[PDB]
Design a protein around this ligand. Structure first.
Ligand code: CA
Length: 351
């Protein structure tokens, strides 16, 4: 990624008459730094010369003057020469090391109708007339470049997010990073296969905010009353400013196949919200229900839970999935093997 910036002015000779403005553009992929120096000499002349100093954390790659590669005059300072035009640009590109930190650029600039050489460059305004006899400038700039960030961001998400059919939910994840700088657009909640909430869970929504040095990820939505009961693996995948991700596409795929976990993974569990019958079932002996009575009990649980479909229980069969004990305690075993238990005494009276 790129960032375009304007560096600090460390020093500038008030008697300079060339530099119009300086900007910087850093590419954090290549870690190339570009210093752009816009020039409007009062005395254009034919030739432009630039004595360039850079901090030890940079090493020069390219220097262009008026769009063309500058002749390298050679050597703390290095001479570059090229064409002088009234609206000119000197562009200096450096490789920044891995550390980054404060970067500096120093400049001694001239125009001249003479060939500009290392023996004839003036070091101060007062020596200009006797040497290059044109325009002159003298400045130093500084700015700060981030350290190379190779450490992935870390998501903290509940290991399990449980939601209920017919109800809304809201959970929260957090992301941190050593750089404390993130890419919120590339921070998502998704299933394995694509950047989408996933087939069967299209209702899964999220939003991302930066709160201080953390990301706050809201995971929320409304669960349809007829969505599939069971569990799903989903992933919080966050990207830092440098482009590091907590879990890569390859890693997610391996984790899904091997049944292992990645940072940011959670299990999304969809549950039915069970309701105890309010309608009383009357039995002969509350400790030994007859088979006829157990069927009354199953029907009453079905009545009190009308959104519980055959396909929602074990083996898609109400008789298999809703079992009733000798004391009328009812177990509802769902298609996924999870279960709810209703105490029989809650809704069973002795006749
Ligand atoms: Ca990082």
């Amino acid at each position: 990624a790129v960032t375009e910036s304007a560096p600090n002015v460390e020093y500038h000779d008030v008697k300079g008459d060339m530099i119009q403005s300086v900007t910087t553009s850093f590419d954090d992929t290549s870690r190339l730094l570009t210093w752009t120096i816009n020039l409007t000499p009062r005395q254009v002349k034919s030739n432009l010369g630039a004595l360039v100093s850079i901090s030890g954390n940079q090493e020069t790659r390219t220097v262009t003057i008026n769009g063309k590669n500058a002749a390298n005059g050679g050597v703390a300072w290095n001479l570059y020469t090229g064409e002088s035009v009234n609206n000119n640009v000197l562009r200096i590109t450096t490789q920044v090391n891995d550390t980054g930190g404060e970067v500096k650029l120093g400049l001694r600039l001239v125009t001249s109708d003479k060939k500009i050489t290392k023996t004839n460059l003036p070091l101060e305004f007062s020596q200009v007339a006797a040497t290059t006899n044109g325009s002159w400038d003298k400045a130093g700039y500084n700015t700060t470049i981030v350290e190379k960030d190779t450490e992935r961001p870390v998501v903290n998400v509940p290991s399990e997010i449980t939601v209920y059919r017919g109800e809304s939910f809201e959970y929260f994840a957090t992301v941190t990073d050593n750089s404390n700088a993130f890419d919120l657009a590339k921070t998502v909640v998704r299933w394995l296969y694509s950047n989408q909430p996933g087939r069967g869970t299209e209702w899964l929504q999220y939003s991302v905010t930066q709160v201080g040095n953390q990301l706050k990820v809201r995971i929320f939505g409304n669960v349809p009353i007829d969505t599939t009961i069971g569990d799903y693996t989903r992933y919080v995948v966050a990207t830092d400013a440098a482009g590091n991700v907590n879990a890569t596409q390859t890693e997610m795929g391996n984790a899904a196949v091997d049944k292992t976990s990645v940072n940011g993974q959670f299990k999304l569990i969809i549950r039915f919200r069970i309701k105890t019958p309010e309608n009383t079932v009357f039995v002969n002996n509350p400790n030994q229900l007859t088979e006829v009575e157990k069927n009354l009990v199953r029907e009453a649980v079905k009545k009190s839970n009308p959104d519980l479909r055959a396909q929602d229980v074990l083996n898609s069969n109400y008789v298999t999935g809703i079992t009733v004990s000798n004391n009328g305690t009812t177990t509802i075993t769902y298609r996924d093997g999870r279960k709810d238990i209703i105490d029989g005494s809650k809704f069973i009276d002795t006749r």
